[PDB]
Amino acid sequence: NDAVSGQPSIKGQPVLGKDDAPVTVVEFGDYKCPSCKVFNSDIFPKIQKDFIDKGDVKFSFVNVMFHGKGSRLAALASEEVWKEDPDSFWDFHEKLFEKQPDTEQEWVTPGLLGDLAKSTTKIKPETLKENLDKETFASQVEKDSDLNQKMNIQATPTIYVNDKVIKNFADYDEIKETIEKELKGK
């Protein structure tokens, strides 16, 4: 039916912000999802500046594989970057979304993900691509899928503010006021 209320576990997920931040915001997204591209450029930067920078919010991203083989390739790459060069993760993450074209045919290839690895991280292009080919990190993608299913994700992006499901990821008033209400409760 609808995404379930409740606090998703961010254990083993990419995180941004202070450890002790009182509010956790989780995005369930997909690198091929055009609404996720919009969230990344239009909404995410406001959450950073209003909340993450000041330590009120810690943010996490969980992979959702809604757009076929390219979603899975992208997710495998994303997982590897988090494990091997976490300090660089959010730079890689942002550039992969920035790379998403406004066209609908498959666009995610190992070569594309390699060049992102090269510009944004300390990881070697050929290492990543070998890992993509071997599906070295398939278990992390499966763990994300398990979590997606547990929360009953129906569409991407789905944003959680603590245990609250955001109804419209594009409504910054909703996101901001919800974060603020949670901060109060804290």
From Swiss-Prot:
Primary location recorded for the protein, binned into one broad class: membrane
Thioredoxin domain location: 1-184
- Output the Gene Ontology cellular-component terms: membrane raft; plasma membrane
Where found in the cell? Cell membrane; Membrane raft
Q: What does the entry give for GO biological process?
A: establishment of competence for transformation
The UniProt keyword set, sorted, is: Cell membrane, Competence, Disulfide bond, Membrane, Oxidoreductase, Redox-active center, Signal
Cysteines joined through disulfide linkages: 33-36
Primary role: Required for the stabilization, possibly via formation of a disulfide bond, of the obligatory competence protein ComGC. May be required for the stability of secreted proteins with disulfide bonds. Not required for sporulation.
The record's comment on protein family reads: Belongs to the thioredoxin family. DsbA subfamily.
* Name of the protein this chain belongs to: Disulfide bond formation protein D
